[PDB]
Design a binder for this molecule. Structure first.
Ligand SMILES: C[NH+](C)c1cc(NC(=O)CNC(C)(C)C)c(O)c2c1C[C@H]1C[C@H]3[C@H]([NH+](C)C)C(O)=C(C(N)=O)C(=O)[C@@]3(O)C(O)=C1C2=O
Ligand SMILES: [K+]
Ligand SMILES: [Mg+2]
Ligand SMILES: [Mg+2]
Ligand SMILES: [Mg+2]
Ligand SMILES: [Mg+2]
Ligand SMILES: [Mg+2]
Ligand SMILES: [Mg+2]
Ligand SMILES: [Mg+2]
Ligand SMILES: [Mg+2]
Ligand SMILES: [Mg+2]
Ligand SMILES: [Mg+2]
Lengths: 343, 225, 51, 63, 132
RNA sequence: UAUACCGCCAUCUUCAGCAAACCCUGAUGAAGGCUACAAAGUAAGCGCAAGUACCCACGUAAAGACGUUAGGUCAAGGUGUAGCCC
RNA sequence: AUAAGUGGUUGUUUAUAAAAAAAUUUACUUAA
């Protein structure tokens, strides 16, 4: 019957079954998902199966300054038109079966390390194209509600940084991943630290910090050493601009305590000039590659002092057993100093 | 080249003098003392961050050191005048309901702004949504009382710091001055003290706003010749 | 590997620029093969070239 | 942009550092006035602690 | 919960027209009838034949002006006449619109044995009443 | 095959809540955001409400979100998947 | 201040994409 035929909108809504009890509470567990096809896509008004040519609709109205009459394509000619239509559809479908190469982060199926591009441009023309954004952690967190039940939210941790000392991080909570990436990405640029770097490649001193239950032991290294540190630290270091450093994470390795502790330790990094000013004495660098050449890296801009700081023969510093363990060739881990790709 | 002349004659010139607006003449230790600015709260109310500024306890009543109040008060007035001269938006924030009328009047008289009312959440950290995307936020905030009506720091003190807005603040012995850019230790309860601060910040602002006019008239004379 | 995906990259002792890329600019050391990813074959040829 | 980390450094240090980095393109209106006439104590956030044990307040009684 | 001819709320991003935005309990209150004839008046005949004609024409027009209609047809009848008032879009060639007006009018007049007219009203975009 | 669905409904509902977008709090955890002599929330939309129908400002209708019960209905019609085609 | 026992089994989060169709002759009748 002609009168039982419905519209494409009504037909796809039923066929796709996007709504229903299956969607809710993950009751339906059929990963295979059909997609709506617009079947009007390649359709031309006036073009039909019989191949008639209607002047003013399917073909041009006037030919050689004269009004065309009703004409019908030849059988052999109509075959080509129908055959060509099949080809375009196939090639149109071909485009949508091509798999796009998603550049992978820490792992193939991991969101950590993946880049979210620059933060969205601000309201009043504020622009953030200098900054990069890498994901640090995606987690489906749940709460219970009286009506629905298990309600999923996405907690996302991102870090932003221009690679010139300015960097931050923020958490984003939303029901949709893409809405949490936005919130986390855009909120981070309003919470930027400035991380002082020694020679714009490493840190000034070595940092030993404990944030809650996470321990981070960071070591200043020379050039070429590279970033030999936890995969989340290398990411954040690339966003800060540190290029050569070592860090070992002990205790708990919660991504969020590791981040909040990494940025805290780096924020308390005392500079060489800040030191010279605090002690009021020259800070002299001794490099083994330069013999006893006394390289003065920072001097007190204010008044210089005259009393040699008392040199305590025995330093009352609390050493770390692992440091001394390795120093004395007692640590024999079959995992330390392994050949790894350049970071 | 107009940038060099405009910047030097207007913005850079006043910043080269120790007291470009002569605000030190506006107050004296005798004037502060006569306004009871040295009277603090009792010793059981004291904040430990306000100790550097307390001269002592006179029968368990903290006496604020007016010698440091004067040095701090000058620094706070100097900043205010330089900001008023630079066409900065100055907001006066208080919640002491006894002086809300006084502080609102004073703000209108010097052509500036006052928020003496319940501070709604996000006025500063969420202003482009509460006002409009092109709203201009204050460049300076003057707290005449830094505690809200439950004896805790006004939320704006923290929100000003989050928005990178310098603040001037009268900090009594029970107040928290860690985040205030220019704390001025002094009594914030006595009407004499509150009248004095309003008189001083009004003058400093007024005087600074005239001088900004009385140094662009010289620009006009210099422009002709 | 980097070398074996571009035929126009000839690891010769004459191609000094290419050789420089595979040596530290700070310590003067030839990277290990896992560092850059060049197969065992090419890394040895490279090593000879460097020397 | 700006940094709303009111607990890390001060408005000066944060601003100063963001200008150096290139985030803040324009020095805020108050920056030059602060730089010329800085306050006696830099406004850095500190958490008030309790005095345990023998720690007492250095405030003396005026006699 | 009632469902008939309600567009559900969604997420504040769904463009809906004044017609679509109103539920059946608003049909004589905030909106009118998409057809007007005398069949459904007390004492009148042929409500059925009018109704079959109106279901066909809406279908006829939807497939005859594919992708052009920007709202629902307004069907009118005065004596022997039939008026089809479409709101269409402005993407098709006016040559094609004139072809289709002349075509539809002619074909429908021979099908329903009456004078049939077709009044187009073009709009740039579909008029949005509300973002549900 | 209603446990793939549209369509049209039951049910709480003789409900008042669902909320995008922000901001803040929790050491940047799941989460949380209340005081009017106010102490961090602003919220567009959708319900409720208002309006309209019936003989009124009353009453009765109607309305009544988001969700809950894989609740009902492939036998209203249409339809994804699977099957039948002497 | 009475007494109110029980309920086979089972169950959830693997990742983005887009079209257009269209425009040469802007006014006669006429004749060889
Ligand atoms: C075997 N049980 C788990 C079951 C299975 C199906 N269907 C299938 O698994 C079908 N599987 C195929 C697709 C054929 C491979 C089912 O479809 C159902 C149910 C449960 C029933 C229970 C029904 C019950 N009464 C009417 C017998 C009832 O009162 C309730 C209730 N909530 O109170 C129901 O949920 C019930 O009506 C219902 O809907 C069932 C199913 O839907
Ligand atoms: K079926
Ligand atoms: Mg009902
Ligand atoms: Mg069902
Ligand atoms: Mg159903
Ligand atoms: Mg089952
Ligand atoms: Mg009523
Ligand atoms: Mg009812
Ligand atoms: Mg109502
Ligand atoms: Mg069922
Ligand atoms: Mg039993
Ligand atoms: Mg049980």
């Amino acid at each position: 019957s002609f009168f039982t035929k419905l519209t494409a909108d009504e037909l796809w809504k039923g066929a796709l079954a996007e709504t229903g009890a299956g969607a809710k509470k993950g009751r339906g567990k059929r990963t295979k998902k059909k997609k709506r096809k617009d079947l009007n896509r390649g359709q031309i008004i006036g073009e039909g199966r019989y191949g008639f040519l209607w002047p003013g609709l399917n073909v041009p109205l006037m030919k050689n300054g004269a009004v065309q009459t009703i004409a019908q394509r030849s059988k052999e000619e109509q075959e080509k038109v129908e055959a060509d239509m099949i080809q375009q559809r196939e090639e149109w479908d071909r485009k949508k079966k091509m798999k796009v190469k998603r550049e992978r982060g820490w792992s193939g199926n991991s969101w950590g390390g993946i880049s979210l591009g620059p933060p969205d441009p601000g309201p009043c023309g504020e622009t953030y194209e200098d900054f990069d954004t890498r994901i640090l952690e995606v987690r489906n967190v749940f709460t219970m509600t009286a009506k629905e039940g298990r309600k999923k939210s996405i907690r996302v941790l991102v870090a932003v940084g221009n690679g010139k000392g300015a960097a931050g991080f923020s958490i984003g909570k939303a029901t949709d991943r893409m809405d949490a990436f936005r919130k986390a990405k855009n909120r981070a640029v309003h919470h930027l630290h400035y991380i002082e770097r020694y020679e714009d490649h490493t840190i000034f001193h070595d940092i030993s910090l404990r944030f809650k239950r996470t321990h981070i032991k960071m070591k200043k290294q020379p050039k070429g050493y590279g970033l030999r540190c936890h995969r989340a630290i290398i990411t954040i270091c690339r966003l800060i601009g540190i290029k050569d450093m070592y860090a070992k994470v002990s205790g708990s390795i919660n991504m969020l305590s590791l981040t909040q502790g990494l940025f805290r330790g780096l924020s308390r990094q005392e500079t060489h000039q800040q030191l010279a000013d605090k002690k009021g004495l020259h800070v002299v660098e001794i490099r083994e590659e330069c013999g006893p050449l006394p390289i003065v890296v920072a001097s007190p801009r204010g008044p210089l002092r005259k009393d040699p700081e008392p040199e305590d023969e025995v330093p009352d510093v609390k050493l770390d057993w692992e440091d001394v363990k390795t120093a004395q060739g007692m640590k024999r881990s079959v995992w330390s100093n392994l050949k790894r790709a350049a970071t | 080249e107009d940038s060099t002349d405009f910047n030097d004659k207007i913005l850079n010139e006043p910043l080269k003098h120790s007291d470009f607006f002569n605000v030190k003449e506006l107050f004296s230790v005798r004037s502060l003392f006569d306004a009871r600015v040295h009277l603090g709260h009792k010793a059981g109310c004291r904040h430990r961050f306000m100790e550097p500024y307390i001269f002592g306890s006179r029968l368990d009543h903290d006496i604020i050191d007016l010698e440091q109040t004067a040095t701090h008060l000058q620094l706070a007035l100097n900043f205010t005048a330089h900001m008023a001269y630079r066409k900065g938006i100055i907001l006066f924030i208080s919640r002491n309901r006894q002086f809300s009328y006084l502080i609102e009047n004073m703000a209108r008289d010097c052509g500036e702004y006052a928020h003496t009312r319940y501070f709604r959440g996000g006025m500063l950290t969420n202003a482009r949504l509460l006002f409009g995307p092109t709203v201009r936020l204050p460049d300076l905030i003057i707290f005449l009382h830094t505690l809200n009506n439950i004896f805790e720091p006004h939320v704006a003190v923290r929100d000003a710091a989050k928005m990178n807005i310098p603040t001037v603040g009268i900090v009594d012995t029970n107040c928290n001055p860690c985040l205030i850019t220019y704390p001025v230790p002094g009594n914030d309860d006595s009407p004499l003290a509150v009248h004095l601060y309003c008189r001083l910040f009004q003058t400093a602002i007024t005087r600074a706003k005239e001088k900004r006019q009385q140094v662009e008239a010289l620009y006009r004379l210099q422009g002709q010749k | 590997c980097p070398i074996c995906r571009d035929h126009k990259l000839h690891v010769d002792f004459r191609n000094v620029k290419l050789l420089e890329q595979f040596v530290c600019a700070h310590t003067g050391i030839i990277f290990y093969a896992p560092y850059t990813g060049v197969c065992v074959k090419q890394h040895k040829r490279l090593t000879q070239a460097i020397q | 942009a700006g940094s709303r980390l009111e607990t890390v450094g001060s408005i000066f240090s944060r601003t100063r550092d963001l200008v150096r980095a290139g985030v803040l393109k324009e020095k805020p209106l108050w920056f030059d006035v602060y730089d010329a006439f800085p306050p006696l104590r830099e406004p850095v956030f500190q958490r008030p602690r309790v005095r345990y044990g023998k720690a007492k307040a250095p405030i003396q009684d005026i006699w | 919960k009632n469902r008939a001819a309600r567009v559900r709320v969604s997420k504040g991003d769904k463009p809906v027209t004044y017609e679509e935005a109103h539920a059946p309990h608003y049909i004589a209150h905030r909106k009118g009838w998409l057809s007007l004839h005398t069949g459904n008046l007390d004492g009148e005949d042929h409500a059925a034949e009018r109704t079959v004609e109106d279901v066909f024409l809406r279908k006829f027009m939807w497939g005859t002006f594919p992708g052009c209609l920007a709202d629902q047809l307004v069907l009118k009848r005065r004596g022997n006449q039939l008026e089809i008032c479409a709101v269409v879009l402005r993407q098709l060639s006016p040559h094609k619109y004139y072809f289709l007006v002349g075509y539809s009018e002619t074909l429908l007049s021979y099908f329903y044995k009456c004078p049939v007219r077709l009044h187009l009203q073009t709009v740039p975009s579909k008029v949005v009443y509300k973002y549900l």
